[PDB]
Design a protein around this nucleic acid. Sequence first.
DNA 1: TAAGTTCCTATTC
DNA 2: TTTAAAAGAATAGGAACTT
DNA 3: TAAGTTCCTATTC
DNA 4: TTTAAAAGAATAGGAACTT
DNA 5: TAAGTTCCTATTCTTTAAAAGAATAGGAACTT
DNA 6: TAAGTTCCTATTCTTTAAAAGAATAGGAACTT
Lengths: 400, 401, 400, 399
Amino acid sequence: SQFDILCKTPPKVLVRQFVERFERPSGEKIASCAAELTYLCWMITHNGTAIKRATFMSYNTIISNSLSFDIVNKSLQFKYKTQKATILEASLKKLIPAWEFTIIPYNSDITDIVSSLQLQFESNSHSKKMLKALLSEGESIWEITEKILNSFEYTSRFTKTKTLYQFLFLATFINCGRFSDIKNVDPKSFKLVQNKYLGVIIQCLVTETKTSVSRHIYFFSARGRIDPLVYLDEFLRNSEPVLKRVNRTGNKQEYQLLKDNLVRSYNKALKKNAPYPIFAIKNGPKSHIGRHLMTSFLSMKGLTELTNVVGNWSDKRASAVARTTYTHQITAIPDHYFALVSRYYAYDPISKEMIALKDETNPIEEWQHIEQEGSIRYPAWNGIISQEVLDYLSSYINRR
Amino acid sequence: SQFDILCKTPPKVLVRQFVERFERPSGEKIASCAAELTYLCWMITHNGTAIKRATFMSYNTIISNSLSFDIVNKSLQFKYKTQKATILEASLKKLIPAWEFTIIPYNGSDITDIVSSLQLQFESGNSHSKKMLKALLSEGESIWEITEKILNSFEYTSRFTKTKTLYQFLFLATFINCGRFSDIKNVDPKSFKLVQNKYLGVIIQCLVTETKTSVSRHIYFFSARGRIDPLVYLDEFLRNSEPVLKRVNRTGNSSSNKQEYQLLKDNLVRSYNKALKKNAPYPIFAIKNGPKSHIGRHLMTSFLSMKGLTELTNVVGNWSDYTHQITAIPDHYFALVSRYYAYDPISKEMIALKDETNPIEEWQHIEQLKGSAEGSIRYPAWNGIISQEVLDYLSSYINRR
Amino acid sequence: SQFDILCKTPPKVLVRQFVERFERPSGEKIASCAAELTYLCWMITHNGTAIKRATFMSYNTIISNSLSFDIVNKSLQFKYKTQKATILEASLKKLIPAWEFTIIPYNSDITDIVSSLQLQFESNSHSKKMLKALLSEGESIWEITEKILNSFEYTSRFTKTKTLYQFLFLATFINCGRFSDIKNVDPKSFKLVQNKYLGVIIQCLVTETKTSVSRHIYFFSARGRIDPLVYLDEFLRNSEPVLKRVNRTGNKQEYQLLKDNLVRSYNKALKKNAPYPIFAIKNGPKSHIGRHLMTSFLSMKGLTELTNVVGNWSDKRASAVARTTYTHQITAIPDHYFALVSRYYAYDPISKEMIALKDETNPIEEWQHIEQEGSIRYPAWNGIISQEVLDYLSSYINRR
Amino acid sequence: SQFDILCKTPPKVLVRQFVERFERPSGEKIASCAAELTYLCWMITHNGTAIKRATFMSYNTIISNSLSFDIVNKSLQFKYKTQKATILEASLKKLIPAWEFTIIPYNGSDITDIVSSLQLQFESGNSHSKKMLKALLSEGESIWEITEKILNSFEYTSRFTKTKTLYQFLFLATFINCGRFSDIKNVDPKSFKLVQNKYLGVIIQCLVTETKTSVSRHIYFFSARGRIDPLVYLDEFLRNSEPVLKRVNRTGNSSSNKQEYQLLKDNLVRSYNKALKKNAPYPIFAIKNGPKSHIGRHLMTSFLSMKGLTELTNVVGNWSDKQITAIPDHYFALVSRYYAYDPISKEMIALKDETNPIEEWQHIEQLKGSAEGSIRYPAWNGIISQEVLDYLSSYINRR
DNA sequence: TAAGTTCCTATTC
DNA sequence: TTTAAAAGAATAGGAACTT
DNA sequence: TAAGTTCCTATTC
DNA sequence: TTTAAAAGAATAGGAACTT
DNA sequence: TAAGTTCCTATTCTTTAAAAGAATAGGAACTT
DNA sequence: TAAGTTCCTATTCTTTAAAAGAATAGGAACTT
């Protein structure tokens, strides 16, 4: 894609190509400066600091949509997310003195506004009210989860896809993370970590998150119909490692858990199977549904205090400076969080305790037996995902 | 009304009509651009963002009053609530290049004047309004006593039952919720629900979305001890007024969601104010431009203050400090306003009054025999609109008493 | 005083007199424009809004100290608490076009700065620490109160003064109010109000307070050697009604409780008798001691919640719009406040209750007997202070 | 030092000396105006407001490094942290009309440069520091384990007892209070008090006023369970170091109040850092410009975060948030280690370990008639509250 | 010996 | 690190007279 | 009959 | 009445191809 | 007398805005 | 088939600046 290409082009070459466009003034040539113009405007306002894919993408669009120019008077303007327009205009000019630039703050023309209105005239909150309904009716969060999960069971056209959809969904719910949170997981960071309520849980790491604050992603045995480890198994056995896509203009992590485009097909599917009204609403949550469900679950269950941590929201109860530079360790999802989500335990608002449900299978005890042929079951991830892990999962699976 | 019409006219048509006015320059034609000019100036400064009724109304007036023009020199000016006049003038011109526009800031001191003015005062309605309000609560009567009085002032002056019902309902409604007329008026009748309350058993709760500051809030109704009972007036209301189709109140064309009904009629306020004005159960109500339908809101604000519960004011009155965000009122608020309990400043808890009648218990009895879908019989007008579960509760409560 | 005179002069006359000063340019004449110049600058920046005494006083001084002028070049300047100097200068000029004005913001040049420093180089916190000591030591608040109170008992040169000092002091303490709070009480507003702990208490009203937020002042029977009603009695029988002084270039209230100058005489006394170190410190609290003491009492007793109300400090729990426009009734001093300060009861931080002290005289019961002549004991306030009140006090007194 | 001298020189004298430099235009003379030029530029932009040591120091350097001039054209320029350069230049000139001044903003981008720079990177500070810090806590050891290690790294490397005492005291001190060096150093020794705390009986509390952000805060010392005990290091400290006369740190020269004593010596930090640097009990400490004395602060910030108690961070560490505030009771409960925090209930739980600090306080508070505190800590006798010196003295022997 | 200081300069919060 | 300055309205004090 | 309405304008929050 | 605007970095959607 | 007053001046508190937007209150001629 | 992909564009999150001040860390030449 354009961005990948930008990343492949040498700085001087970019600047080079940008100038050539203005030597033999052509509409064909000036009309495409967009991508380059983006890179330049950024590099200027940030002094060589690399630019991230998404950002380049957004801005490129913004410029491309607003770009306009007069070849005769050598004047070109466009919109950009900035407030020090002048400084930028000056810079651009030094590069092409013969021209006049005019950067317009992103943040109009009547006839446009009008037609736009005249258009609408002929045609978020809704989704929030719909989610409320979805929840505030017959079933529970878990019941809803299973339903959504099952809506893929028969509709999917391939096994990989069915596997991917269900894995992703459940994954996003369990961790209250975004698509990108699950997608950018470094497969080589899978570990078994202890948890006083479940014996052990699988933990991996995501670094390239939205707010650039690393967090862990977990997988663990759950009681009942829905079991993460199971979907994790099905996942591993149908999808293979993905080479970490480059997401910024610069110059280490060779793999990523899912494919960047999984989200489109996922959303598209979730949209069609529409296991609930909410999913019909255009621009309504899609992949993000997982996140909202767990946020609600925690609330409804009376544990909002965990939400921020589980979901990874910069915590404001601590001075920014105190976080930015005096804290050196990815905050921990508290032990009991998993206890609850695993369903082998319940929460007593009064006794402020986890009450192990009298199910016959004890999560801890069963771990012991397992701890007391992995590389064979998951050949694709063999050599990538820790063997210690591949074994645990392999066992756990057969062990059932 | 003009606004409704604006909402019915297609964008291009509006712009169209606005231009035609300047083709065959006529006083008749240019003098009416007002409404259109308003729409345009807004759309420009807000980039397609819809405009609310009230706002359009205010601005339309402002322009209309200030509009002036020279057909010969093709120059037209008017006032508008803006500070980037130039940008706007430019825009207007592109639409009609042949003309010159001049937007004058709505918002933008000579000694000798000031002096003479003072020299005038030295020798011999608003600051008066606030005095009477202080007075009102300053004299003997308690808030509740005042409320009952005002309430009764409609009892024998109203010309119809509907009106008597409406006035008393509205008044008590606004007091109980410390809400504005619009708060009660824009309630979505289809949102009535029974909600539990540890002090009164249950209370009726509805929802208002189209509020002034566009911050949704709930409106409540509940059993109260004594001669004034909300549920009773709610009953009388329901049995004399009917659902009202939600009026459109902004240029958009959103035909999605948007509640289909509203609790009261937009014009109720005029007749209400007018009545409250004439019956003038108190001096305050005589003062021109003094509070009228708003009185309810001042009373509760004062009640809360005087009682030492200002912490609730902001929430109750709804002022600024994936959930469809809305904040309700604390449980004990109703406990107090219902009068079945008393507030203890020292402990800060709500204390029930050893008066035999304990509200909670009476709710139980009512909740016990259901199946008596007799609610839908007493309130036929709201049948199908207001939750049956609610219509039953009220119906029972009423008969049960 | 100058201010009173200003209030007596007609607007046009003032402006008149101000101009005459500049017709026959005289140092004598221009040097006195001060008072007038103040009035004008205010009226301008506030558009006819009346000006309060204190404010006029402060500003008059500020101008007077900074006023300077050149009769030859017709240029005059002075300092004033403003930031829109120009607007003001323009206005002044229209009144006297022949002149040039220059308003200098109240709230530079090196050589000045330097000399200033060179000056300092050669030459509040204390009082706060001293108060801490005063408190954070042996004697209790009440013990301290009695001592201070007694320090006037013999030092005073007259009975009226001894009465005034002791009344004022105890008054300010009981109500945690300033001098002005006690002084500006409308004597015609005395009432008997019920209180479920003491039977009844005397309540009066102050409107002309600093923050212009009316509040009530109380008097009540107290257990022990210090009894408000007693000092209230002694007060009433030695001082007389005071004509409400005008305090704004304007409102109705024909009388005020104390004389405006009582404070000087009071401070001066409290200063000399210095019953405590604190009172020696220049500019340290004088009449204000009473407030501080109660503020501390409430805190120390664990009842800060009452402080704001009792002392009257703008509520911050309700939007200003709400406080301003909609709140129409003075928040009420909670019932138990008096219970505590009266000393017939104690406060239990745990049980959150007032515990009546087993004293033999029940405040409530004794009220009954009294409720089951006054115009003779308090002839001066006869016709001014409610008879119902004069009787209650009269009785209570004799009844002892 | 230069700063102390500035503080000793009379205003008019300074301005005097500054002008003389320009009368007989000399490279020798103009080249030294630096310190004076600093004082002037500040006094101007702040109108007589005194200037703090550190600030003067920083600015003096900035000017000194940037100062340049032409004796022939009588033109002199330098950098300064300002944005209203002109106003300042004008002022300076009035003082020396014959000259032309040009104040250059300390804080600021040519494309072609940027580009080439990028074109360069395309082919092939804290960063490393922040990696090790992550590492530190990432590896095995717990915060407390790390603390003890660092603490012990001084035990045998120190060349004197005073120094060994100082280092260990300071370190543990900074950690317990999550304060800066200056926070511990500027404590007014005469402000020590024994305050009650429903979880440990009592704790020692002192006061610091001259803090970085000029927001006073308290510094505490208390009994802790295990090998690491603050009271113990506090004891060792008191018995080897002595009161320090509060150094003047601002050209305010206001004669009154101002505590006369400071807890530690201003230069303790250099040696401390230098030591911590060499003993490098951990990789982190090797990184140049990486945290050193500060380490204690970072540890507690992390401790609180990791423990799920960030709500306490701002208070404990003294950062701006929305009668100087003071640490919640349970904070000490936790750091003392006699109690454990329960995330689910959110209460502090004492450990069934026999030694209940509260009870042991009682015993100590009981048997009086022991002014023997003033005997163990003679140096601080008369400075540190006796009530305190007794408590510590007892506690110590009592163990 | 250096670890300690002393007194600026360089870095960081 | 951090981030509300100041208008406007009291309460002290100075000092020359009064009782 | 005048209280109630209709639809702007004037005021206030 | 109200009073954090917006840069920067995700997650939906559109639509023409692939299987 | 020197405490008690006058009448300014010097210090020290308390509380804060402006204006685009969006309601509520009033004016008049109509409606029932 | 259309579900599943590509590769942009359109919407919707998430957190916060810039720089004057004010400490802490380091450089070098001295010192106990």
